[PDB]
Enzyme design. Structure first.
Site, short mmCIF file in Angstrom:
data_model
loop_
_atom_site.label_atom_id
_atom_site.label_comp_id
_atom_site.label_asym_id
_atom_site.label_seq_id
_atom_site.Cartn_x
_atom_site.Cartn_y
_atom_site.Cartn_z
N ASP A 142 4.81 -3.14 1.81
CA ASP A 142 5.51 -2.98 0.53
C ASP A 142 6.40 -4.17 0.19
OD1 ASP A 142 7.47 -2.48 2.52
OD2 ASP A 142 8.65 -1.34 1.09
N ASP B 162 4.96 -9.04 3.62
CA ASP B 162 3.66 -8.48 3.99
C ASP B 162 2.53 -9.23 3.28
OD1 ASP B 162 4.82 -6.52 5.65
OD2 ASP B 162 5.08 -5.13 3.98
N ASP C 74 3.42 -2.11 8.26
CA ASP C 74 4.84 -2.36 8.08
C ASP C 74 5.56 -1.03 8.33
OD1 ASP C 74 7.29 -3.72 7.06
OD2 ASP C 74 6.95 -2.48 5.27
MG LIG Z 1 8.58 -2.80 4.09
#
Ligand SMILES: [Mg+2]
Ligand SMILES: *[C@@H]1O[C@H](CO)[C@@H](O[C@@H]2O[C@H](CO)[C@@H](O)[C@H](O)[C@H]2NC(C)=O)[C@H](O)[C@H]1NC(C)=O
Ligand SMILES: CC(C)CCC[C@@H](C)[C@H]1CC[C@H]2[C@@H]3CC=C4C[C@@H](O)CC[C@]4(C)[C@H]3CC[C@]12C
Ligand SMILES: *[C@@H]1O[C@H](CO)[C@@H](O)[C@H](O)[C@H]1NC(C)=O
Ligand SMILES: [K+]
Ligand SMILES: [K+]
Ligand SMILES: [K+]
Lengths: 268, 39, 992
Positions: C686, C690, C345
């Site tokens: 995070d 995800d 990410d």
């Molecule tokens: Mg992120």
């Protein structure tokens, strides 16, 4: 193939052949040096045989010799081992002044034939007649068990002195020259009868010390025949034969450390 | 000795055990010292 | 099952408001009926998420109790009770042997079960985190009246109302809104507020303004909407199910464990039954044939090995806990070392997740600011009088403020009330000009026009802090081009000057460059109003232009971006040097995604996309050979119409990949694509978007401070300080533990041979038993334990970060080379050293090696209390047994003595001990404690009863010393050959 090619299969064989060959050659080398540090006449350690064991001829199934008097093949098993032992104490086996010697027909003192050396031939052992074993095919009724003290090189079995009290209190106490053997069971439902050298219920000290198989082959250890002409029948009788001495001790674990454990039963 | 060679069939397993246990303990302490040089 | 959920969603934002009501039998104004709502409740079911069915811990524990070694140990434990049963019936055996050994072995299985159970842990509460995002209550309009209801009682069709501060209770079709902004970070990973209005604004429902989603929250304003989806049927409720439903799967390390279990189990059953028949042929009673088999089992199975592995893993996880890297699953300690591809990410992972000033354009010059958290860069300018003029506008023409009580925390980390751009500017000036509040106190704001959608600028009028003036200063900021159309002069190095086409062109150049860097650019200008035309009491009208807004003085430009975390660029390069492929997978827009890719080193300098080639050469993209482009940037909207085979080609054909504007399922798809090619993949993230990717990853790593609760539930590892450098450490630790496990496994296995061989020679030679079954367990469960563990503390033998990731198909934890060395070479030398001490003990007590062959018959005969030794002496039963058990004790101690050398040689696979040294203090500890344990077991009174261990004479300890030394020399010579010729012979044969 499985793993590799033929060329690789060969190389892995040539390696392990030389490798294991070397390892075998090294192992053997270390065995050589071990042997080189040892005597031919006497073992390095003797503390593990120290207190002599007492073993008998009747091959006990489990410290027991039960049979039927009214049956032939009921005791023919115990007579096999009994014969095996006494067959060794033949007179034809003890011929000439070599390597046997006529010793006192009465319990005598020790005999030192020098040291544990080869500086002399075969150390001459005392003769022993199976004919000293009175009364004992064997006892088809009321067995005639034969006792024996385990051989230990350089061991001098020392009898107890009549300073204080004794089990068989002072009776026929040949204090100076006899290692006594008194069998027991309370529970006194038997009839103990002992046979041996000089008619004594012990081991004549003139058969000691033992010089070992290498310095004394054909050597004969003293026997002590014991007969139980018990007037009882059809019951397990726990009879314990105990030897007494200064160098004799016992253990709760080793039930053969200077003593017997016989479970006779004339179930007839 | 001659007939008095009782020492031939004897071994001081008691001392050996005392010494063996001393050694085991000290090796145990030494190990702690080296391990505890930083935790 | 979940293949449906891996697809992009379909919606009804295209319908009119009225049309949408027909579909759901609803009223736009009155809302649903109390009766109709309750009807729909029973129909569709609750607005809730149901957690997936889990496997109870019962079945999880017991599943370990039947994995190769445990199976063999079970066969042993029962076979003990078998022989015991056969005894208790036949001849009354007052002993406890088979009974107790059967109890001991069964305990070994149970305890070993706990260790593997502890290792195979799965702490997963994905669906629980999602459930936390549904509010307890919602506001609905029913029978023309608004009431709060249990949010679970919400159904498709009713009229819902939301306002700033509340969570979207369900997927809504916006029908009415007033200044409504929403935080869609759940779906995008981006927290910038998105406007919501009734008007449809994109074909894509995840981008349109007239849809609001469950799992997000309203940030400001008010909105009303019609519920289109409820519970599991919402967009993120499906993501929830997808994430929670995904099959976990076996880790690389787990697969390795099972693999050597098969090997060792194989040789165990082989030799087991190979000698079971070999005994019956020799005329051994089944009574004995089973007793030998039990011994064979115990000899072949390394009883303490699986627990060693677990402890070595645990200890490695403890070290990483001490670098702010939390491991939730013990196996994930190794996966990072085997990782060949990282899918990362961007926002909050690679980046700080905070709009930060990156560059400034003043004095006809581009200046760069420091974007790093801890400010690890340098200054750009302080001297220029122009800077102070620009700095003043950035502070004054700004409505952002620091939250109360932050004075303790660093400037860049403190919470700010305001939009991202104003916060960035605030923190910029506060950093390099001190307290901004001071500047706003020295220059009192009298009138302002806040940033307007139409004006595209924000202006402010302040009382000049200067005493000699104390007059009125005008400042404004806005779109760079709009600010330009309002300027006549430029503050160059202090003094103003006319805005000639020259500087105007340099402005465009500066503007295009900063924008090309993916940075948001703002214009800044001011104007000192004429004193005579503006008295100290002159009133300014903000509603109607009461003051000039043209012919102003352009001061400068400022650019900003959500920047990389300081450690990220360097960590990315380090991953790439270790041969790990790094891919970006983000919900963010392509221009931003691509710019950070270059910033952190995902896309290296000079590498082009097909679009880059086309623009440079000024040719159509179809005219470009796509193989000429090693880099690519894929938008999610294009990804959607590509098959997996085509996704596989993208993955194969590019070294530098950026997946931008991806949905959560799309992240999962990219991860699966990478895995499909046979790669071990890590995911770093995070956000809740995800979660599926993190779950599917061989190892998911979540950020600890910036991470959402969901992401950290889906992960195997948490970076508690958001230190991306930890990934680099993790992969390094992962590789090190992999090598050290080999060392520890070889060490443990090596001692199997000296435990097997005595039992074999017992049969083939008919000699007294050299080593007992109990004695074996004193080794594998006792002495070898701490030494085997200590190998986990071994330093690397070379630069492990310099090698490529292991090939999980070829590079195994236990291979033929390990067995050859442990079983064929070193263990064989240990066996002999054991036997030697055995022959020494017996020969020194009177039983010379020659007379031992074929004596076991009379030796074991309990009724022969007069066995003749070599010297003609007679032994009772218990007497000779004491010597025999003393043989077991010295054979045992011989193993310990030969394991000394083995421990030292297993220290290194390649290097010499003279190179690697002896700096492992745990290992040395192992040596001392191992020897202490052995001595204690031999000399402690009473151990002769409980374990049949007998006191050894001093000379006994030294029997195996020459064998211990040969091992050290042999292995040292062998490894000397390895190093001296990287060719292969010694290497390809023995190099673990
Ligand atoms: Mg992120
Ligand atoms: C040791 O003495 C025993 C005494 O019983 C011998 O047994 C003799 O066996 C032969 C042939 O089987 C019989 O004819 C005799 O009746 C047995 N007794 C005697 C006194 O001769 C045995 O053979 C002897 N063993 C050896 C090796 O000489
Ligand atoms: C007690 C004694 C008699 C048993 C001796 C067993 C010997 C023959 C065994 C023990 C370990 C074995 C080796 C272990 C490892 C390998 C590597 C593999 O790729 C091919 C087989 C090979 C080379 C084995 C061949 C046979 C081997 C050398
Ligand atoms: C033993 O045998 C002798 C003959 O040799 C006999 O006189 C005696 O009665 C026997 N003793 C016993 C107790 O039976
Ligand atoms: K084992
Ligand atoms: K995972
Ligand atoms: K082992």
């Amino acid at each position: 193939f499985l793993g590799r090619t033929g060329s690789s299969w060969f190389k892995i064989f040539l390696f392990y052949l030389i490798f294991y060959g070397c390892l075998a050659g090294i192992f053997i080398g270390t065995i050589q040096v071990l042997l080189l540090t040892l005597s031919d006449f006497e073992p390095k350690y003797q503390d593990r045989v120290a207190p002599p064991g007492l073993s008998h001829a009747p091959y006990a199934i489990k410290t027991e010799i039960s049979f039927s008097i009214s049956n032939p093949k009921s005791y023919e098993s115990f007579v096999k081992s009994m014969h095996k032992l006494m067959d060794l104490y033949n007179e034809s086996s003890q011929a000439g002044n070599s390597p046997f010697e006529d010793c006192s027909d009465t319990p005598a003192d020790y005999i030192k034939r020098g040291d544990l050396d080869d500086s002399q031939g075969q150390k001459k052992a005392c003769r022993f007649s199976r004919m000293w074993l009175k009364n004992c095919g064997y006892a088809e009724g009321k067995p005639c068990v034969v006792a024996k003290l385990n051989r230990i090189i350089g061991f001098y079995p020392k009898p107890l002195k009549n300073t204080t009290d004794l089990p068989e209190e002072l009776q026929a106490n040949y204090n100076q020259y006899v290692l006594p053997l008194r069998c027991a069971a309370r529970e006194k439902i038997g009839s103990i009868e002992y046979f041996g050298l000089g008619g004594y219920a012990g081991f004549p000290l003139q058969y000691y010390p033992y010089y070992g198989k290498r310095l004394q082959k054909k050597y004969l250890q003293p026997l002590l025949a014991i007969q139980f002409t018990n007037l009882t029948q059809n019951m397990e009788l726990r009879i314990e034969c105990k030897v007494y001495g200064e160098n004799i001790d016992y253990s709760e674990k080793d039930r053969f450390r200077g003593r017997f454990e016989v479970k006779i039963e004339v179930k007839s | 000795e001659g007939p008095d060679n009782d020492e031939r069939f004897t071994y001081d397993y008691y001392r050996l055990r005392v010494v063996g246990l001393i050694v085991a303990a000290v090796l145990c302490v030494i190990g702690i010292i080296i391990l505890l040089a930083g935790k | 099952l979940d293949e449906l959920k891996k697809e992009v969603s379909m919606d009804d934002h295209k319908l009119s408001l009225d049309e949408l009501h027909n579909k759901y039998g609803t009223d736009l104004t009155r809302g649903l009926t109390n009766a109709r709502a309750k009807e729909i409740l029973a129909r569709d079911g609750p607005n809730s998420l149901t957690p997936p069915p889990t496997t109870p811990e019962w079945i999880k524990f017991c599943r370990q109790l039947f994995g190769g070694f445990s199976i063999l140990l079970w066969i042993g434990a029962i076979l003990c009770f078998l022989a015991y049963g056969i005894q208790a019936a036949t001849e009354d055996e007052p002993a406890n042997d088979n009974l107790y050994l059967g109890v001991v072995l069964s305990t070994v299985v149970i305890v070993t079960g706990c260790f593997s159970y502890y290792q195979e842990a799965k702490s997963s509460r994905i669906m629980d985190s999602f459930k936390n995002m549904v509010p307890q209550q919602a506001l609905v309009i029913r029978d023309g009246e608004k009431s709060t209801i249990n949010a679970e009682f919400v159904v498709a069709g009713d009229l819902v109302e939301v306002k700033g501060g509340d969570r979207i209770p369900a997927d809504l079709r916006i029908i009415s809104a007033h200044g409504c902004k929403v935080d869609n970070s759940s779906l995008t990973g981006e927290s910038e507020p998105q406007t919501r209005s009734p008007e449809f604004s994109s074909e894509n429902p995840l981008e349109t303004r007239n849809i609001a989603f469950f799992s997000t929250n309203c940030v400001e304003g008010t909105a009303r909407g019609v519920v289109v989806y409820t519970g599991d049927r919402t967009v993120m409720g499906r993501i929830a199910t997808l994430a929670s439903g995904l099959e976990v799967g076996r880790t690389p390390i787990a697969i390795e464990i099972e693999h050597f279990i098969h090997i060792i189990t194989g040789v165990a059953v082989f030799l087991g039954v190979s000698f079971f028949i070999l005994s019956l042929i020799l005329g051994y009673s089944w009574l004995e044939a089973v007793i030998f088999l039990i011994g064979i089992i115990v000899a072949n199975v390394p009883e303490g090995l699986l627990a060693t592995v677990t402890v070595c893993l645990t200890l490695t996880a403890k070290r990483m806990a001490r670098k702010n890297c939390l491991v939730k699953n013990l196996e994930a300690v190794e996966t990072l070392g085997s990782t060949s591809t990282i899918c990362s990410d961007k926002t909050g992972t690679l980046t700080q997740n905070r709009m930060t000033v990156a560059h400034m354009w003043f004095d006809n010059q581009i200046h760069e600011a420091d974007t790093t958290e801890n400010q690890s860069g340098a200054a750009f300018d302080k001297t220029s009088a122009t800077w102070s003029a620009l700095s003043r506008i950035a502070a004054l023409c700004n409505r952002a403020v620091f939250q109360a009580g932050q004075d303790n925390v660093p400037i860049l980390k403190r919470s700010v009330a305001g939009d991202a751009s104003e916060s960035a500017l605030l923190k910029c000036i506060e950093l390099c000009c001190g307290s901004v509040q001071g500047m706003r106190d020295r220059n009192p704001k009298i009138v302002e026009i806040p940033f307007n959608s139409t004006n595209k600028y924000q202006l402010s009028i302040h009382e000049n802090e200067k005493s000699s003036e104390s007059r009125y200063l005008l400042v404004m900021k806005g779109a760079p081009e709009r600010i330009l159309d309002r300027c006549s002069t430029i503050l160059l190095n202090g003094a103003e000057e006319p805005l000639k086409e020259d500087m105007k062109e340099a402005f465009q150049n500066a503007y295009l460059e900063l924008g090309g860097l993916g940075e948001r650019v703002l214009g800044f200008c001011h104007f000192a109003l004429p004193e005579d035309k503006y008295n100290e009491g002159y009133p300014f009208d903000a509603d109607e232009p009461n003051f000039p807004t043209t012919d102003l003085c352009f001061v400068g430009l400022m650019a900003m971006i959500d920047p990389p975390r300081a450690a990220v660029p360097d960590a990315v390069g380090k991953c790439r040097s270790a041969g790990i492929k790094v891919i970006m997978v983000t919900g963010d827009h392509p221009i931003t995604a691509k710019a950070i890719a270059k910033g952190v080193g995902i896309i290296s300098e000079g590498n082009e996309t097909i679009e880059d080639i086309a623009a440079r050469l000024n040719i159509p993209i179809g005219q470009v050979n796509p193989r000429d482009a090693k880099a690519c940037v894929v938008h999610g909207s294009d990804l959607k119409d590509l098959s997996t085979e085509v996704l596989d080609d993208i993955l194969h054909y590019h070294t530098e990949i950026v997946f931008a504007r991806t949905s959560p399922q799309q992240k999962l798809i990219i991860v699966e694509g990478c895995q499909r090619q046979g790669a071990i993949v890590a995911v770093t993230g995070d956000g809740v978007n995800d979660s599926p990717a993190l779950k599917k990853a061989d190892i998911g790593v979540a950020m600890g401070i910036s991470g959402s609760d969901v992401s950290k539930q889906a992960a195997d590892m948490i970076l508690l300080d958001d230190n991306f450098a930890s990934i680099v450490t993790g992969v390094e630790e992962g590789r090190l533990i992999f090598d050290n496990l080999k060392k520890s496994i070889a060490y443990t296995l090596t001692s199997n041979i000296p435990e097997i061989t005595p039992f074999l020679v017992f049969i083939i030679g008919n000699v007294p038993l050299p080593l007992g079954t109990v004695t074996i367990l004193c080794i594998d469960l006792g002495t070898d334990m701490v030494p085997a563990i200590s190998l986990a503390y071994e330093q690397a033998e070379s630069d492990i970060m310099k090698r490529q990731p292991r090939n999980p198909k070829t590079d195994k934890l236990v291979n033929e080379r390990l067995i050859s060395m442990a079983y064929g070479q070193i263990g064989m030398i240990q066996a002999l050293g054991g036997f030697f001490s055995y022959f020494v003990i017996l020969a020194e007590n009177g039983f010379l090696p020659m007379d031992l062959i074929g004596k076991r018959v009379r030796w074991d005969d309990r009724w022969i209390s007069d066995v003749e030794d070599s010297f003609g002496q007679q032994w009772t039963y218990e007497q000779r047994k004491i010597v025999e058990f003393t043989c077991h004790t010295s054979f045992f101690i011989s193993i310990v003595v030969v394991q000394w050398a083995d421990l030292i040689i297993c220290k290194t696979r390649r290097n010499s001990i003279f190179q690697q040294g002896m700096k492992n203090k745990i290992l040395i500890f192992g040596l001392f404690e191992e020897t202490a344990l052995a001595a204690f077991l031999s000399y402690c009174p009473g151990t002769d009863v409980a374990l049949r261990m007998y006191p050894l004479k001093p000379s006994w300890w030294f029997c195996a010393f020459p064998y211990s030394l040969i091992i050290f020399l042999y292995d040292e010579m062998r490894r000397f050959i390895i190093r001296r010729s990287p060719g292969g012979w010694v290497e390809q044969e023995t190099y673990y």
